[PDB]
Structure formats: structure tokens, C-alpha cells
Ligand binder design. Structure first.
Ligand SMILES: Cc1cc2nc3c(=O)[nH]c(=O)nc-3n(C[C@H](O)[C@H](O)[C@H](O)COP(=O)(O)OP(=O)(O)OC[C@H]3O[C@@H](n4cnc5c(N)ncnc54)[C@H](O)[C@@H]3O)c2cc1C
Ligand SMILES: CCCC(=O)C(=O)O
Ligand SMILES: [Mn+2]
Length: 455
């Protein structure tokens, strides 16, 4: 990367906001995944959207790849600079604007995390529900199409993103639904917002997101329920969803995951396949949700172990399951699967996955958003054992292909990044791949917007 180019970047954002130091580049060359760190050639922190546009235009016209970088919590290698280039760290734009409580909407810049937003919203009666375990950038969550434990009731990012401000690869500024607009529904033109949700930084740079807010629940009850088998836990889940109980949270942990979270968070749940449950409503709405849910679990479920601080540590432990699993083998890294299947096929694929981890020499923990038909197999990898890392990728492929055989998808929320590109090709077939690539080509003709990812 030439000295004239660096000085051009510094002219846009300021000398302190451009770095070519190896240490700073290495810190931005990886996320939380096991994907080998590939450092960008520079890191740049734009201070406003005009600077984002001007950095993108500079890179694009000089043939330099651009890698958007939020909080670096992705798990599929999205920020790895496989072709070098300029990593654009967006987190200095960190303002919340246009809070419209009467309309249930708010606009956030990329440095705003979910915690920051919900802190800003205390005593408003509103909250933002989509809750990845990591303290992630909300614009990064829009870019990956994130979900979380609350999505079974309150929806994913795709359900809760109303508008996006996007700097296209050549620097043009697009407001996907129109500048300043926010509304409940529209048939106006083609829906551009949905195209950029889940685009993983390959179609442009999200510089603000307009989010749907929700009313805080009148009352909340959380509980855990221990089961004699994985089959019993997932059968309960399927029957709870088919009975149309509007559960707020329904999270599965197998016995390996439960033990790991016990040891990492000083919980003391019985070591067993377990459901973490949460219910929202009034006292009366809660009583019959609990009535009907506990009748279904009583598939051999234990009496509910009920859980302010007490449910807070329960869901903090769930949110840290990734780190709980890594703590089972210090020094190792991890890869997560993320399949999502039609709910009636969930029992057979979790039970099969449990059996396959057991028959394997790999250490694997199972956790996830089974209310969506989605779950994660967290597989540990020694960063120096190439042969374990191949057993893990092979396990991951086979699980992905089994989900596709059942009519499902290879990723419910994490995205494709570097690790699921071949699965995506199988998932949508030749016409789907070409159509996706034609969209990529019209927005990013030179292929400089996060190259090597998704397609
Ligand atoms: C402990 C833990 C728990 C997690 N739990 C969940 C979970 O429940 N659900 C879930 O969905 N994910 C989960 N994740 C994954 C991760 O938090 C999400 O994928 C999150 O949305 C990533 O946001 P980020 O800004 O940290 O991404 P980054 O790693 O910074 O980037 C991710 C990808 O998005 C692109 N990108 C980032 N910001 C932008 C932007 N502003 N514009 C355009 N492209 C951009 C990057 O180029 C990259 O390809 C978890 C991760 C961890 C470590
Ligand atoms: C990062 C994999 C774990 C995850 O997504 C979760 O905690 O739900
Ligand atoms: Mn998850």
C-alpha cells in the first residue's frame, strides 16, 4: 500500500485515524472465529458519513479492497482481509438520533451497541429486543442479519430494521427506504432495505440503521427445565410452538453446554439437556402460558426452576455460552454451526447431532434458538492441530448438508463469511448463485467490497 495512498487517507479522516502499524492491523484482521487472522494493510476510523464516502471512493478508484469493521464479534471470518486492503472501523460514529418513542423507532450509528441503546432507553418504556450474546454493533448486526434469544417472539434484525443508510462501494449515499423515512409497511418500489440486511459488508457500508422498538413487557417470568434426554427437550419445544404458546425465550442447552455454563458462570443447574424459558405478559396471560407450557414439558420435564438479578445472571450465562464452551479447553478456538430447519425436523437433526458428537473425538457443546428451528454446535479446535481442524470442518459440512437435505438453511443468523460459501452454493443452486452475484456486481462492479466473502 503506497505512501501517496496513505497520505490521501489521512487527508480525509485525520492523521490519528489512519494506522499502518502491524499490531493495530493484526487486531483488526480477525474476529471471534477460528479463521486465521489476515491483517488489512491499513485501518481507518472515519469520523462522519462524508468521510466514509470519501474513504470508500478513494479505495474503490485505486483498486484497494474495503473491509467494514464493527465490533469484530462475527464468527465466520467476515473481517478477515483475505486480499489485504483497508479496514474501515466504523465505531467512532456512535450517536443515537431521531428517537421517536411515539412511533416506536430510533436511528443508530455503527458505534452504538445494543447495551448502549437499551441504556439510553431506560425509563422510556421501550427496548430493542434482538440480543446476540456479544456486545455487538447494531449496524454490524444489520449487516450479518443477526438474531438472538428474543427473536422467537420479537423477530430478527430483518424483522426489526426499518431503514438503512448505506455508503455504496463507490461512495454514493443510499437511504434504502428514503432519507428520514420510517413506517410500518410499504409497497413502494423494490424493498432495498432487505437486500442490505445480511449483506455482510459485501454490498456497501451501513452507516446508520433505523430500528423498530418494542414496548417493555408488563411482567416477566424466567425458568429452567431439565429433561431426561435431548429428544424429550426438543419434542417439548416443537409441541410448545405447535400449541402456539407465545413464549418470549426458549433456549436449548445440552448436558455438555449446561455443565460448561455452570462452571463458567457459577450457576448450579442440574447437568442435563435443559430449556431456558421466558414468558412475557400480564399476570393472567402469564398464568395460562405457564399452565400450558408446563403441561407440555411434563415429555419428562422437571418442575420449573424459577428465576431481577436472578434472571439477569441466567441470561448472562446463556449469552456467554460461547466463552463457557471455550473454557472447557483453554488455548483452543471454536467454530459454530448454525443450521435452521423446518421445526418438525428439528428433533431428528439435534438428536443426530448429539449422537454424532458423542461418536466423535471432538469436543462439542450444543445450544441455541430452538424456537426458530435453529441451533449451534460449538466445536473446539486446537489452533495447532491441523487434523482436528479438518475433522471439525468435515463435521460442520456434514451437519450443514444434513440441514439442507431437510429443506433448511445452512445459517439461521451468523452468515456465510468465509466458512459456508460452498454450502450456500448448494442451498440456492446455480440460478440463485448467479442472481446473487449479479446483484453484487451491480453494486460493487470492481469486486472491492469485502472480497472473498459470501460468494
Ligand atoms: C459470544 C458471542 C455470542 C454471539 N451470539 C450471537 C447471537 O445470538 N446471534 C447472532 O446472530 N450472532 C451472534 N454472535 C455473532 C456476532 O455477534 C454477530 O454476527 C454480530 O452481528 C456481528 O457484529 P459485529 O459489528 O461485531 O461484526 P464484525 O465482526 O465487525 O463484522 C461482521 C461482518 O459484517 C460486516 N460489517 C460489520 N459492520 C458493518 C457495517 N456497518 N456495514 C457493513 N458491513 C458491516 C463485516 O465486514 C463482516 O463481514 C455472537 C458472537 C459472540 C462472540
Ligand atoms: C457465537 C455462537 C454462539 C451464539 O450465537 C449464541 O450464543 O447464541
Ligand atoms: Mn445465537
Amino acid at each position: 500500500l503506497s505512501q501517496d495512498f496513505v497520505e490521501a487517507l489521512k487527508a480525509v479522516v485525520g492523521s490519528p485515524h489512519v494506522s499502518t502499524a502491524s499490531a493495530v492491523r493484526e487486531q483488526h484482521g480477525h474476529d471471534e472465529s477460528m479463521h486465521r487472522c489476515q491483517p488489512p494493510d491499513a485501518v481507518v476510523w472515519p469520523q462522519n458519513v462524508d468521510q466514509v464516502s470519501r474513504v470508500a471512493s478513494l479505495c474503490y478508484n485505486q483498486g484497494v479492497p474495503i473491509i467494514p469493521f464493527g465490533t469484530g464479534t462475527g464468527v465466520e471470518g467476515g473481517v478477515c482481509a483475505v486480499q489485504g486492503g483497508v479496514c474501515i472501523n466504523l465505531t467512532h460514529m456512535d450517536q443515537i438520533t431521531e428517537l421517536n418513542t411515539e412511533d416506536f423507532s430510533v436511528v443508530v450509528e455503527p458505534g452504538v451497541t445494543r447495551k448502549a441503546l437499551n441504556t439510553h432507553l431506560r425509563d422510556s418504556g421501550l427496548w430493542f429486543p434482538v440480543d446476540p450474546g456479544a456486545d455487538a454493533s447494531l449496524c454490524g448486526m444489520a449487516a450479518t442479519g443477526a438474531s438472538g434469544t428474543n427473536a422467537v417472539r420479537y423477530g430478527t434484525m430483518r424483522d426489526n430494521v426499518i431503514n438503512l443508510e448505506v455508503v455504496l462501494p463507490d461512495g454514493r449515499l443510499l437511504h434504502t427506504a428514503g432519507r428520514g423515512r420510517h413506517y410500518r409497511k410499504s409497497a413502494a418500489g423494490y424493498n432495498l432495505t432487505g437486500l442490505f440486511v445480511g449483506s455482510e459488508g459485501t454490498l456497501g457500508i451501513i452507516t446508520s440503521t433505523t430500528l423498530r422498538l418494542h414496548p417493555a413487557p408488563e411482567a416477566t417470568v424466567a425458568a429452567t427445565c431439565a429433561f431426561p434426554s435431548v429428544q424429550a427437550a426438543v419434542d417439548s419445544t416443537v409441541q410448545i410452538l405447535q400449541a402456539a404458546v407465545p413464549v418470549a425465550r426458549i433456549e436449548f442447552l445440552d448436558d455438555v453446554m449446561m455443565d460448561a455454563c455452570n462452571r463458567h458462570s457459577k450457576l448450579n443447574c442440574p447437568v442435563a439437556p435443559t430449556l431456558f424459558l421466558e414468558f412475557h405478559g400480564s399476570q393472567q396471560t402469564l398464568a395460562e402460558q405457564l399452565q400450558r407450557t408446563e403441561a407440555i414439558t411434563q415429555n419428562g420435564g422437571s418442575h420449573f426452576s424459577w428465576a431481577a438479578e436472578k434472571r439477569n445472571e441466567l441470561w448472562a450465562a446463556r449469552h456467554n455460552a460461547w466463552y463457557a464452551a471455550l473454557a472447557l479447553s483453554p488455548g483452543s478456538k471454536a467454530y459454530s454451526t448454525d443450521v435452521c430447519v423446518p421445526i418438525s425436523r428439528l428433533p431428528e437433526i439435534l438428536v443426530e447431532t448429539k449422537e454424532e458428537i458423542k461418536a466423535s473425538k471432538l469436543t462439542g457443546a450444543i445450544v441455541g434458538h430452538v424456537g426458530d428451528g435453529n441451533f449451534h454446535c460449538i466445536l473446539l479446535v486446537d489452533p495447532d492441530d491441523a487434523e482436528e481442524q479438518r475433522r471439525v470442518k468435515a463435521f460442520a459440512e456434514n451437519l450443514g448438508r444434513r440441514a439442507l437435505a431437510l429443506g433448511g438453511t445452512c445459517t439461521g443468523e451468523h452468515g456465510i463469511g468465509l466458512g459456508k460459501r460452498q454450502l450456500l452454493q448448494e442451498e440456492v443452486g446455480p440460478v440463485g448463485v448467479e442472481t446473487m452475484r449479479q446483484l453484487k456486481n451491480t453494486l460493487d462492479p470492481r469486486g472491492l467490497m469485502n472480497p472473498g466473502k459470501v460468494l
